[PDB]
Amino acid sequence: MRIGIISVGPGNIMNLYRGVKRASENFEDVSIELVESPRNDLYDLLFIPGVGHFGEGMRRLRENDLIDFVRKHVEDERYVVGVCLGMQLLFEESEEAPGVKGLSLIEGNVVKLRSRRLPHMGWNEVIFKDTFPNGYYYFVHTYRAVCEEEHVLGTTEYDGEIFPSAVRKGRILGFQFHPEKSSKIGRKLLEKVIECSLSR
Amino acid sequence: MLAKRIIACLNVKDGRVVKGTNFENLRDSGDPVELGKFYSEIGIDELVFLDITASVEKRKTMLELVEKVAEQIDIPFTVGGGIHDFETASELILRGADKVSINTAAVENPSLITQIAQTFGSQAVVVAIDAKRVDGEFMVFTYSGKKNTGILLRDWVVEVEKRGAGEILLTSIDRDGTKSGYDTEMIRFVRPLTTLPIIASGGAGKMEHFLEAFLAGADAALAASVFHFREIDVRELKEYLKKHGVNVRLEGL
């Protein structure tokens, strides 16, 4: 098992890395590398974290030529897991950066939650269609995902508004919350991910 | 639904946990990191680290603290106490802190609140407001409650939100460390003046006090004594709050 973590996009990503190393603990031959640029080999599981403006992250994936690299992962049927800003980068565009296109690996766009308490920050419940454990995780975002029902994997409601907190398109996975900051429940979510990549 | 939060405060000095009644016989109560991991195991939703380290050493001891915590903790944490400028804040956040807390340096320079928000986002700014009743009005106090700024609490929470703060840590100097109960009157006073999240701090003594703070409008209840001493089991508390209509983060088996 080879796990890689893009570490260029804005925001803290070391937490994700740590949460993941702590998770990949109880597993055989499972390593972790901070993917800071295009490697020669492809990972079995890749993470696209980050926290910040949609423009940036996109402009950081381009700049350090990771776009083409990420794209090759999906094709070889390599898990590609976005987390927070990185789950939104799986889509086409955002009201955050109107012009700016994103990776576009998943059909949809990113819209600003329609709440007056703009920053959705705190522990909220996530209801999964399957696989992962239902419960409360920690959230810190302003924008959300707008995608067909087909890809919705996890749901959460905030201020009456129901939105996809999780996303999925085969081996590509997205999570809007910070599993690294979600206590015990976060580690099982992180582990379940690694356990899903032990197959392909 | 977004959950009402239970927050644990850890007053720390020169890298260790301290607990007393004042500088008086300020005593040593353990390792900050290991205590945080314990708080995260029982159900605490967030951590607030309040440092009072010497001074010349304040800036380097806090960075060491953040880093030590960031490599082992799995829940969000705020750091504060003596953060007087953008530099100090940015290093703590870049270092691993989720949010910083500023009080005295915020009142003297409201633009600071804004400077941090503009770079890291409101989500990273907690403004701690220490208030007390004085001649019938709610007054703001700085320098650990030793100076009456003359600014009213009503104008200040409004100013604070306007500048960009993302959360308020409201402490009642009157009830702080007394185990009598939270100052629910002060909480209700502030609730209508702002839409920002309110962390109730000061006076926590038993489970019902938490129910009282939340009925007053608090978004989160902070305490240090009670959880440490084990006087309150967080699991019991969350089940008690849920039983009576409060939406809390209930883990499960």
XYZ file of C-alpha atoms in Angstrom:
453
model
C 0.000 0.000 0.000
C 1.266 3.400 -1.154
C -0.662 6.452 0.077
C 0.079 9.924 -1.249
C -1.065 13.347 -0.106
C -0.943 16.442 -2.329
C 0.597 19.124 -0.074
C 0.599 22.262 -2.216
C -3.017 23.539 -2.251
C -3.627 26.226 0.413
C -4.422 25.620 4.047
C -3.234 23.114 6.577
C -2.743 19.656 5.120
C -0.367 18.262 7.685
C -3.322 17.503 9.956
C -4.807 15.388 7.157
C -1.426 13.721 6.693
C -1.175 13.016 10.426
C -4.733 11.806 10.731
C -3.970 9.501 7.806
C -0.668 8.205 9.154
C -2.363 7.557 12.444
C -5.028 5.682 10.533
C -2.722 3.731 8.235
C -1.112 2.557 11.486
C -2.872 -0.767 12.038
C -2.221 -1.934 8.496
C 0.447 -3.930 6.691
C 3.034 -2.392 4.356
C 1.210 0.944 4.058
C 3.263 4.099 3.522
C 2.563 7.770 3.054
C 4.207 10.376 0.846
C 3.603 14.109 0.596
C 2.933 14.475 -3.156
C 4.493 17.894 -3.776
C 4.849 17.401 -7.530
C 4.349 14.710 -10.251
C 5.956 11.399 -9.217
C 6.982 8.682 -11.659
C 4.810 6.034 -10.022
C 1.120 6.127 -9.161
C -0.254 5.667 -5.667
C -2.894 3.161 -4.632
C -4.754 5.878 -2.706
C -4.391 9.631 -3.211
C -5.705 12.537 -1.091
C -6.510 16.058 -2.304
C -6.821 18.216 0.847
C -6.561 21.918 1.288
C -8.640 24.694 2.766
C -9.135 28.062 1.095
C -10.219 29.866 -2.090
C -11.302 27.626 -4.998
C -9.161 29.652 -7.385
C -6.087 28.871 -5.354
C -5.640 25.131 -4.951
C -6.609 25.053 -8.590
C -3.833 27.543 -9.343
C -1.553 25.446 -7.115
C -2.402 22.155 -8.797
C -1.749 23.746 -12.195
C 1.412 25.590 -11.123
C 3.106 22.410 -9.750
C 1.704 20.345 -12.629
C -0.357 17.920 -10.551
C -3.518 18.210 -12.646
C -2.328 15.793 -15.312
C -0.892 13.621 -12.501
C -4.182 13.458 -10.561
C -6.072 12.738 -13.741
C -3.880 9.682 -14.430
C -4.866 8.294 -11.045
C -8.554 8.226 -11.787
C -7.948 6.502 -15.124
C -5.860 3.621 -13.673
C -8.701 3.088 -11.213
C -6.727 4.544 -8.332
C -8.783 5.945 -5.486
C -8.731 9.729 -5.477
C -10.095 11.186 -2.283
C -10.775 14.870 -1.902
C -11.215 16.431 1.510
C -12.776 19.815 2.063
C -11.504 22.388 -0.465
C -10.215 19.374 -2.366
C -13.621 17.770 -2.628
C -14.908 20.915 -4.268
C -11.957 20.858 -6.654
C -13.420 17.611 -7.985
C -16.121 19.752 -9.672
C -16.460 22.161 -12.625
C -16.632 25.722 -11.231
C -17.513 27.832 -8.186
C -19.275 31.080 -7.436
C -16.084 31.688 -5.496
C -13.984 31.835 -8.661
C -16.565 32.363 -11.477
C -14.249 32.019 -14.465
C -11.950 29.401 -12.973
C -12.601 25.814 -14.032
C -11.737 23.019 -11.615
C -10.604 19.433 -12.089
C -14.109 18.473 -13.260
C -13.788 14.780 -12.345
C -17.322 14.894 -11.042
C -20.373 16.487 -12.662
C -21.507 19.512 -10.747
C -20.538 22.960 -9.578
C -20.003 24.694 -6.235
C -22.501 27.149 -4.811
C -22.493 29.292 -1.654
C -24.746 27.888 1.076
C -27.908 29.997 1.346
C -27.583 30.734 5.055
C -27.145 34.067 6.859
C -24.597 32.533 9.237
C -22.269 32.128 6.225
C -19.394 30.094 7.707
C -20.832 26.606 8.381
C -18.537 25.797 11.331
C -19.052 23.086 13.934
C -19.938 19.451 14.487
C -22.881 18.317 12.383
C -24.368 14.919 11.610
C -23.552 13.031 8.454
C -25.892 10.340 7.154
C -24.207 7.919 4.735
C -25.858 5.813 2.044
C -23.503 3.036 3.170
C -19.970 1.874 4.057
C -18.827 4.673 6.404
C -20.147 5.237 9.993
C -23.058 7.636 10.542
C -22.428 10.348 13.091
C -21.125 13.837 13.807
C -18.010 15.224 12.078
C -16.370 18.654 12.128
C -17.141 21.139 9.328
C -15.615 24.470 8.248
C -16.759 25.651 4.802
C -18.761 28.407 3.135
C -19.466 26.716 -0.186
C -21.134 23.389 -0.951
C -21.581 20.848 -3.716
C -24.342 20.764 -6.339
C -24.251 17.381 -8.088
C -26.656 14.800 -9.431
C -28.146 12.462 -6.879
C -26.121 9.609 -8.359
C -22.926 10.863 -6.694
C -24.364 11.915 -3.312
C -22.788 9.577 -0.707
C -23.305 11.549 2.479
C -25.943 14.053 3.588
C -25.947 16.787 6.254
C -28.407 19.575 7.021
C -27.474 23.041 8.177
C -30.045 25.793 8.801
C -32.784 23.872 7.016
C -30.531 23.433 3.992
C -29.718 19.847 3.044
C -26.453 19.337 1.170
C -24.130 16.522 0.040
C -21.449 16.344 2.733
C -19.933 13.352 0.944
C -19.539 12.699 -2.770
C -18.698 9.678 -4.900
C -18.158 8.559 -8.508
C -16.731 5.051 -8.435
C -13.248 5.123 -6.955
C -13.223 8.914 -6.630
C -14.384 9.992 -3.177
C -15.078 13.361 -1.640
C -15.747 14.452 1.960
C -16.703 18.004 2.931
C -15.673 17.618 6.567
C -12.260 17.352 8.262
C -11.951 13.715 9.280
C -8.634 14.615 10.981
C -10.596 16.818 13.367
C -13.495 14.455 13.938
C -12.234 12.532 16.974
C -12.776 8.748 17.143
C -15.422 8.797 14.415
C -12.944 10.527 12.097
C -10.359 7.771 12.406
C -12.798 5.023 11.472
C -13.842 7.102 8.461
C -10.169 7.469 7.522
C -9.527 3.759 8.108
C -12.582 2.624 6.160
C -11.125 4.592 3.269
C -7.779 2.763 3.474
C -9.695 -0.548 3.757
C -11.607 0.244 0.576
C -8.358 0.785 -1.328
C -7.054 -2.653 -0.312
C -9.115 -3.802 -3.285
C -8.477 -3.285 -7.047
C -28.269 19.931 12.716
C -25.218 21.816 13.961
C -24.436 20.677 17.509
C -24.205 22.799 20.655
C -20.625 22.385 21.867
C -18.970 21.314 25.131
C -15.577 22.987 25.405
C -12.672 22.224 27.710
C -10.228 24.927 28.707
C -6.612 24.170 29.701
C -4.778 27.068 31.361
C -1.112 26.409 30.625
C 2.246 27.909 31.629
C 5.727 27.249 30.241
C 4.441 24.127 28.455
C 2.583 22.548 31.364
C -0.954 22.536 32.684
C -1.541 24.776 35.674
C -4.426 24.928 38.157
C -4.781 27.103 41.236
C -6.746 30.143 42.429
C -4.286 32.761 41.202
C -0.543 33.212 40.734
C -0.830 32.593 44.500
C 0.003 28.903 44.626
C -0.387 28.389 40.890
C 0.369 24.646 40.807
C 1.383 22.044 38.196
C -1.472 19.876 36.862
C 0.071 17.741 34.088
C 1.027 17.478 30.406
C -1.141 19.611 28.029
C -0.909 17.172 25.145
C -1.852 14.000 27.047
C -4.714 15.791 28.816
C -6.082 16.956 25.472
C -6.026 13.388 24.130
C -7.974 12.352 27.200
C -10.516 15.134 26.678
C -10.952 13.952 23.087
C -11.601 10.390 24.246
C -14.482 11.268 26.593
C -16.342 13.492 24.183
C -15.124 17.090 24.518
C -15.848 18.837 21.193
C -13.146 21.515 21.258
C -10.157 22.703 23.236
C -9.163 26.176 24.379
C -5.510 26.579 25.472
C -4.962 29.713 27.640
C -1.289 30.477 28.240
C 0.199 32.770 30.876
C 3.879 31.861 30.393
C 6.517 34.202 31.881
C 6.611 36.791 29.068
C 9.916 37.096 27.188
C 9.266 33.389 26.715
C 5.558 33.777 25.931
C 6.082 33.762 22.182
C 8.347 30.734 21.889
C 6.575 28.630 24.502
C 3.254 28.983 22.679
C 4.688 27.859 19.334
C 6.143 24.801 21.045
C 2.727 24.125 22.601
C 0.814 24.345 19.310
C 3.253 22.037 17.571
C 3.215 19.468 20.419
C -0.616 19.483 20.349
C -0.996 19.497 16.543
C 0.841 16.182 16.165
C -1.364 14.272 18.534
C -4.791 15.894 18.741
C -7.779 14.888 16.605
C -10.227 17.690 17.465
C -10.175 21.472 16.877
C -8.335 23.797 19.247
C -7.963 27.505 19.901
C -4.886 29.157 21.359
C -4.682 32.491 23.123
C -3.480 34.729 25.915
C -0.906 37.353 25.082
C -1.347 37.292 21.301
C -0.816 40.989 20.595
C -0.354 41.249 16.804
C -0.788 39.695 13.374
C 2.678 38.119 13.401
C 2.125 36.151 16.606
C -1.294 35.029 15.317
C -0.078 33.927 11.882
C 2.754 31.858 13.350
C 0.428 30.051 15.758
C -2.064 29.303 12.989
C 0.565 28.320 10.459
C 2.086 26.261 13.226
C -1.042 24.122 13.582
C -3.621 26.056 15.640
C -7.197 26.037 14.331
C -8.115 29.395 15.845
C -6.504 32.127 17.873
C -8.063 34.060 20.655
C -7.377 37.767 21.147
C -8.876 40.073 23.788
C -6.739 42.951 25.088
C -4.979 43.403 21.759
C -8.348 43.359 19.986
C -9.879 46.169 22.052
C -6.886 48.442 21.651
C -6.729 47.731 17.916
C -9.975 46.432 16.374
C -8.208 46.365 12.985
C -6.327 43.324 14.281
C -9.492 41.238 14.254
C -9.768 42.244 10.603
C -6.129 41.589 9.718
C -6.399 37.977 10.848
C -9.758 37.423 9.163
C -8.507 38.834 5.824
C -5.688 36.307 5.653
C -6.975 33.257 7.520
C -10.709 33.942 7.537
C -13.200 34.835 10.283
C -13.308 31.116 11.061
C -9.909 31.537 12.668
C -10.640 34.470 14.910
C -12.064 34.139 18.370
C -12.403 37.341 20.311
C -12.477 36.703 24.031
C -14.579 39.312 25.792
C -14.221 39.634 29.552
C -17.157 41.531 31.034
C -18.577 42.616 34.397
C -21.391 44.797 35.793
C -20.354 48.300 36.813
C -22.888 50.821 38.039
C -25.702 48.949 36.320
C -23.973 48.635 32.911
C -22.056 45.729 31.351
C -18.437 46.899 30.959
C -15.547 45.372 29.017
C -12.289 44.665 30.866
C -8.783 44.008 29.577
C -5.485 42.994 31.152
C -7.017 39.869 32.596
C -9.966 41.790 34.013
C -7.883 44.463 35.727
C -8.766 47.462 33.596
C -12.164 48.914 32.835
C -11.934 49.957 29.175
C -15.038 52.120 29.496
C -16.481 50.447 26.394
C -19.965 48.985 26.849
C -20.513 45.318 26.132
C -23.394 46.218 23.821
C -21.354 48.411 21.467
C -18.341 46.088 21.579
C -19.951 42.785 20.458
C -21.387 44.737 17.533
C -17.982 46.285 16.783
C -16.349 42.882 17.163
C -18.622 41.201 14.619
C -18.332 44.151 12.262
C -14.525 43.845 12.246
C -14.875 40.254 11.163
C -14.570 38.045 14.260
C -15.980 34.561 13.735
C -16.802 33.616 17.335
C -17.001 35.185 20.775
C -15.692 33.740 24.007
C -17.807 35.573 26.575
C -16.542 35.341 30.135
C -18.287 36.815 33.144
C -15.626 38.021 35.591
C -18.375 37.830 38.225
C -18.916 34.038 37.972
C -15.494 32.909 36.714
C -14.058 30.116 38.880
C -17.008 30.108 41.280
C -18.887 26.923 40.303
C -22.118 28.842 41.014
C -23.470 28.665 37.456
C -22.983 30.585 34.193
C -24.033 34.231 34.046
C -27.152 33.517 31.946
C -28.319 37.113 32.286
C -25.175 38.416 30.515
C -25.598 35.753 27.831
C -29.182 36.828 27.059
C -28.037 40.436 26.953
C -25.545 39.600 24.191
C -27.581 36.988 22.283
C -29.766 39.527 20.438
C -26.875 41.911 19.646
C -24.985 39.470 17.424
C -25.330 36.480 15.113
C -21.840 35.232 15.936
C -21.423 31.971 17.906
C -21.225 32.471 21.676
C -19.040 30.360 23.925
C -20.256 30.711 27.518
C -17.383 30.780 29.997
C -17.233 31.036 33.757
C -19.144 29.558 36.663
C -19.603 25.987 35.457
C -20.329 23.814 38.491
C -22.755 21.028 37.524
C -24.646 19.493 34.605
C -27.735 21.703 34.897
C -25.624 24.879 34.559
C -24.924 23.789 30.990
C -28.635 23.455 30.309
C -29.059 26.970 31.671
C -26.338 28.468 29.457
C -27.850 26.931 26.344
C -31.368 28.116 27.205
C -29.827 31.599 27.405
C -28.594 31.339 23.841
C -25.046 30.048 24.137
C -23.722 28.012 21.223
C -21.111 26.385 23.428
C -20.264 25.995 27.093
C -16.647 26.153 28.249
C -15.275 24.956 31.574
C -11.997 23.652 32.966
C -12.406 22.657 36.618
C -15.397 20.336 36.297
C -14.108 18.005 33.525
C -10.560 17.784 34.869
C -11.470 16.804 38.479
C -13.911 14.310 36.904
C -16.726 16.154 38.760
C -18.635 15.875 35.485
C -18.682 12.942 33.096
C -18.977 14.378 29.591
C -20.973 11.337 28.390
C -23.557 11.813 31.170
C -23.713 15.541 30.448
C -24.372 15.114 26.738
C -27.128 12.583 27.427
C -28.676 14.899 29.996
C -28.652 17.831 27.611
C -30.126 15.724 24.805
C -32.878 14.426 27.082
C -33.975 18.032 27.629
C -34.091 19.359 24.069
C -30.504 20.398 23.384
C -28.858 19.116 20.218
C -25.423 17.810 21.259
C -22.633 15.706 19.715
C -23.540 12.285 20.996
C -20.980 9.669 20.048
C -22.259 6.138 20.572
C -21.369 2.461 20.875
